[model samples]
Each structure stands twice: as C-alpha cells, then as structure tokens.
Target: IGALEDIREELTMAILAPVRNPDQFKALGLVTPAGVLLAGPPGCGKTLLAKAVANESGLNFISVKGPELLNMYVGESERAVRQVFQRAKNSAPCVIFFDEVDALCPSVRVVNQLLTEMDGLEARQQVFIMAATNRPDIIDPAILRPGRLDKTLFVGLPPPADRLAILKTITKNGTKPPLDADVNLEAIAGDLRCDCYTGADLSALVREASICALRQEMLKVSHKHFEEAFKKVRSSI
Candidate 1:
C-alpha cells in the first residue's frame, strides 16, 4: 500500500481510462498483454497491490503461491498449473496472480517441465496472468518474452507523501511517535529513501513500538518508546 503511492498517478490514470467508455479498456493496453511481471525487494507491496487490483476490477481472482505449486510427484506440478489455467479460462475476465513466480519459473534447465506447460498452452480468453518476483533475472527468459509476460513493473520503497500516509495509517492512535514528536515526515522519508523500507516495514515499526511500550512498562506508548523501537528494527530488503 505504501509502495504503490509512488506510482499512484500512473495507476490512477490506467484504472480510470476505461470509465469514460466501455471500450476505453482497449486503449489501456491491458487486454493485448497476456501477462505482467511485478518485481522488487521483499516486503514491498507487490502482492497487496495485486489483491487490490483484483478487488477493484471485480474480476475472478485465482492466486497461487510459489511453494504451493511445487510437487514431489512427477507431473504433479504440471498438472496443477494446467488445472489453475483451466479454472482461469473458465472464468473470463479473471486475474491469475502468481506470487513469487521466480521460484516456480526458474531457468529453463532447472524447470523444463514447467516451461513446457507455460509455453505449450493455447491462449485463453480474457484471462490475464500477473506474476511477482523478487529475483527477475532468475526467471526463465521464455516467460518474460512478448505475448507472455511483456510488461515489467517495479514496486519500490514508498515516496515521501506515501511514507507519511503509511506512518499515519499504522500509528493512527499516535500512542507513540519518534523522540522528536514534531519531526517532519518529509525529512524522515528522505532519510529512509535509501533504506528501501516497504509497506511491511512500516507495519513492523508500529508493532515494534508496541513491543517497546510493553518492555518499558508504559501504560501508553510514548514518543521515546517509538524511537527505541525504530532503532531495534532492521530493514530486510
């Protein structure tokens, strides 16, 4: 949610274009593209954004996590892929969200069967496959080619306004804030830009603040408590 605001203007335009006319969707280029690839550091809001899209579009959403598709039995993984695609096709105007696709769609040499399943299929109607990966370089080239996953989008750290909004969202009660309670969020966000904090990072910070309050034996979280928590939490990616 925090990371999405950086590209909010672009996303807003894309979503609103079709509202003027039913056929306006064709101009958005979403229909021509068979799939999209979302790549970024872990903890970014890639999966959350995909879920939001599914909810807003009112389309059938079929989600598959990377590990869930793995199978020890021969042909089982392929079967699962086929079944998922079948269900997606049956529900037209659907979104097939593949989370952590890099795991399931590694190099061709590593996953020959999976490649065959992805490439050897007939095109289905109105079914768009959207995948997210932290390691884009490891994804099979075949999967990134045009007419497959042609569009590649990145979900990075949130911008200044986004960070402030995220901070407000997580610390709604203002039970705890930084030692400098009046600290300007814009400056804080600028300082954290290179930190590559994600939406999850903000959530974790709030959780840590609560932990600090408990550890300090405070009835309510204070500004200093939040500062203590901030120092304890480390960025994952």
Candidate 2:
C-alpha cells in the first residue's frame, strides 16, 4: 500500500470522479462507460484495490468469483451475468467486481454477453464494473476493448517500504500474538531484497513468524522467529 500511492490516486480519480460529480461529468460528456481492469501477478492486492474503491466511494459492492459464475445448466451462467449487471443498475452507483475475470467469461458467447451488459446505454451511467485477473493474456480481447474494460491498472509486487507497511498491518491484528520490540520489521522488509515479494507474501511471512512464536510457547514474536519464517516462506510472485 505504501508504494501504490500513484495507483491509489489514479483508481480513485477514475472510479470516484463519476460518482462524486455525476452531473458535471454528464454535462461535459465525460461519463466513464468503460470499467477498469486490474491485472498483475498474484496476491498483489488487485482484488483488494477494487473493494477499496467501492468502500471509498460508498457504492454497493457485489463480488463474484470466476468459478462461482459457472453453471452446468445451459444459459444459467449467461443469465447470472446479466442478473449481476441488472442488480448493479438497479442499485445505481454500485460496483460489480468480477474476480479472475479471464476465467469467468472464457468463451466468446459469454464475453459478448458481458460486453453487452457493460456497453448497455442505461447501465453504463451508474453501474461501474470492475474486474481483476492474473492472466490477462488469456482474456478475450473484446472484453478489454474500448467502452468495456478500457482502463487497465497493473498491480505489481511491492517495494521494500510497502512490504514493511504490509507486514506492520498484518501484525497489528488484535487477535494475533504481540510482536517483541526486538522484532525489526524494517530490517525484515529490507531483507526481502526487491520486487520479488508481494503483499500476500509479507503477510504470510508475519503469520509464519507468529506461528513459530506460538509453537515455542512464547508470548511475543522475535526477530529470530522472522528469520526462521523467511526461509520457509517463498515469494508468490
């Protein structure tokens, strides 16, 4: 999160601007008909970014993962897709987040249907469609075409500062065991090297260290615990 200030600002302006100044945007013919696509390596917080946008905008958030939208019954999946867009439209200023979108609408038919929903004149004004995917290469090109998922945001692995911030945030959980003052998160973050680690990786590192401390019957986590965990935890990206 610390290294993603630019991304946060871009997403906020792109998604929240319409909601905050709808009338002004309409008057200037600047409606954001095409939604945004967040693409990057796994566990880099693309999905989290979408949820954050919804929360910051105070919009209704409807989340649907790729596998959940699949139905063996004919036409059911397409129908479900339509229903999702309809609900977003009905609940104006809503955010419909399609996670792993590359897998959700794999076929051309399904992609076309999704395109229709996004391109619909009525729904485009208020229903903001946001999707995340790790495999953007496999996704249908039409889905990424203009007036669809036009805006693309790439969420790469975090820098050392962000890794430190992410580690601190994860360890701050009230339910988690306390960390010892000797546990140098800053040093641990620096040891991560570069963009090899993701936000999830840092979070897992903390979890691993906490579990190690717990197993040792310790009340607080120590730097040694993190060193042990570092060897066990590998970068996801």
Candidate 3:
C-alpha cells in the first residue's frame, strides 16, 4: 500500500473503476474484464492485495485453492467447481480469490469447469474471479489469452522511484521524522546492493533500526542505527 503505485493504479482503473461505475462503461459497449489475475514473487504481498480488494470494493471475500476444488473422481470434481461458482452467483457483488491458481489448472479435468464458470458471468453480476500465481507461464494461455482472465498485472517488486517514494513516505510525518534527519535514505533505498528490498523488508528494517536507536537510549534514529539494522536484517524477498 505504501509504494505499490503501478499496481494500485492498474487495480483502480482496470478493476475497481468498472465495478464501481459500471453503467457508464456498460453503454460504451465495453465489457468488464472477465477475470483479473495478479502475479508476483513470494513475500511481495500479492495475496494481501486481494484482501484489500475485498475491503475496498466492499464485497465479500471468498478464497479457493486448487485442492479444495478437487476430489478423487472427475464428476464430483466438476461438481465442486460448479458449487463454488454457484455460491458466488448466489452471493453476487463478491470477490472470489483463486490462490495457487496454476496448481488448480493441472489437476484433473477441472480446468474446463473453471473456464466455463468464468465466462458465464456478466459484468452486471458483480461477481469477480481473481487468480494469483508465482508462475503464470505454467497456466494455459487459453485461460487468459483473448478473454477469460484477461485483466492481468505483474507487479513483482519496486523500482528505484517507487523505492524512493517508499522511503520518503516513511520519513515524512514531518521532515523531522522519528528517524533522525541525518540519515540519507536515498543511499539506503537506491544503493545497488539494496536492490532486493521489498516493501515488507523495508518495514522490517525500519522496525529494527528503531530498536537499534532505543538500545542506545538515543532520541533520534541515525544512519548508523539503520546501518546496524541492515547488518542483521536481510531482504525478505
């Protein structure tokens, strides 16, 4: 939330705007995306973004994974998928999240069921399916290519500008932040060696640095406090 600007922008325009103001978009002969997919590596909080979607959209959150849609036999498995979507239809204006969605595809015959269920819904239903995977390439293109899960976003990590924004936001409740004024955040955030820091990693670093400051009974956070924090806290990538 602090610095995922690109991710947030796409989510707002592609997903939120359509659902919130569908009438205008509808008459334009524009269809809301059939499904939305979010992709990124582990620890970057992609799943957390799904929860935020449920909260921000003011919709119920229903999460399903590959295993829950499976059974020992094909008929029952297909039925399982139906019941899941059926539940969503009954509870329209809800967000259905598919975590580890790629795993769901390779399992038995449920992929077809997933496809049909996704395509069956209309924008007016306000029921959305959002899938997430670390490995989107493993998913069949048919699932997302022309339509099915067409609204896709790959927000893996922060670039330098976003990282700079992250640092600036953290330090600014005042220019005189609890972290001392002497710290050069650009060196910490933009240092080539610090490239792997994710949002979670920086947060952890901040916490660790604050503790480092307190350990010395110091009133202000210094560069060396963060320097020590860096020595102990590796990136949470």
Candidate 4:
C-alpha cells in the first residue's frame, strides 16, 4: 500500500492483537462506538492525520470546519448540525471530521442547538465522528461524553522518527537522492527535540536542505541551516 496505509496497518495490528474476547468492531475508533477527538497544539497535522486515517481505512470522509456552523439566525446552527449528521448517516462507513470543533462546541450556554442536535439521534452504524481542536477544555461535556466523542487523543508535534520520515518524504519527493546528498537526517532530528516545530516546519526545513544540497554546500542537512531558519521563523503559538 502507501505510507499512510502501512501506518494504519501497524496501528490496527497493535490495537486488535489484544483483547482476548475481541469486540464487535474490527478497528479502534474506526468502525463505530462513539467518536474520537484529536486535541493538541495548532498546526500539528490533525487535519492531515484525519485524512490519512480515512484514506487508509477506505472510509468515506465528510469534513467540517468550526466557523461554518455558526449563523446569525436562530436554529441555523441546529439545521447545519442536522445536515452534517444526516449526510453522514446516508453515507455509512464514513468518517465525519470536524476541524476546530471548539468553535461550534464551545460552552453549553453558547451551543444549546449543537447539544440538542447531538442528543437528538443515534449516530449511524459504522459512521465515526472524528473531531480536531486545539482547545478541548472549552468543549461542552455533553458532546464529549461517552456516546458522542468518548475517546480524546492528543496529536502533538512529530517525534524524532516522525520528523525524519517527514523530512525524507518532502525532500525525496519521488526521486532518489545522490549518495552525496544522502544527508544525516538523524542528526537534524536530534536538534529538533522541541515541539515548536510543526509538520510544515519540518517540510520547510527539508526544502531548505534540498536547496543547500543543490548549492553543493553540506552533504547533509546541517544544524547551521536549521538555526538560521529557527531564528527567522515565527509561529502564531
């Protein structure tokens, strides 16, 4: 399969190998149950991971952003919620990904309509609701309960291995690197122990490394380039 498929297979094996009795669902947080909430710092590839999960699982994907649910008129938010759920149900075995869920699912006082919609009906069979947000504490408890979105996961910055893999993916881009250009990705990874770097940041670092290679400067990605980029880069967080 693909890189994402390989990761998915590994994750599935890890989750399914256990549990002596074995549950009805084949995949963890994929087949049914409640839902999953991916919460962490911004720009940590929550959206990308959601898409990758859908891709590897062969699940239909229905994506929704936070701001799209709000409306000036009353009952509009409820209508939007209904539409989202209805569409997902009609397309079973699907993944409903809500990005920036905190906006629509803030406090109970602010989101009575959303809460009503969530409580109104049973989530479809084999339809999984996966939400991503930077702020999980602000989300309403009713929506986050065991039935709505029970499992909450933190998708933080990539680990050193993931960083190196990301770097290799971006720099290689379907081309074999020359022996001289085969940079020591582990060394660069060692210096990137901080969570300040996002996936995009790693990709940008790889781009810089490629440029450096083209210029015949360092055989591999060096700390000097990373330091320079870090000094110049600014993040919203």
RMSD of each: 6.4, 4.4, 6.5, 7.3
- Candidate number that wins on TM-score, 1 or 3: 3
Mark the regions of model 4 whose C-alpha exceeds 4 Å error after superposition. 1-32, 107-124, 160-196, 202-237
Worst 10 residues of 2 by lDDT: 1-10
Error of 1 at 171 (Å): 13
List model 2 lDDT by residue over 1-237, tens digit each: 443454445545546665677787678876464577888877886655555445545667788788877764447888888888878777867778888888775545777788887777343346666788887888887888877887777778777765655565566532355877777777887883435777677767877888888889838888898888877786554
Please name the candidate that would achieve the greatest lDDT relative to the true structure.
2
Using all chains and alpha carbons, the TM-scores for the candidates as numbered come to 0.58, 0.69, 0.62, 0.59
Order of candidate numbers by lDDT, starting with the best: 2, 3, 1, 4
Tell me model 1's lDDT, rounded to 2 decimals.
0.62
Candidate 2 segments exceeding 4 Å error = 1-3, 52-61, 86-94, 121-126, 160-195, 213-228
lDDT of 4: 0.59
- Model 2, total clashes: 0
Q: Cα deviation in Å at residue 46, candidate 2?
A: 2.2
Worst 10 residues of 3 by lDDT: 1-10
- lDDT values of the candidates? 0.62, 0.70, 0.68, 0.59
Candidate 4 lDDT for residue 60? 76
Tens-place lDDT per residue, model 1, 68-95, is: 7766444567667778877877786567
Evaluated with TM-score, which candidate comes out highest? 2
91 in model 4: Cα distance from truth in Å?
2.7
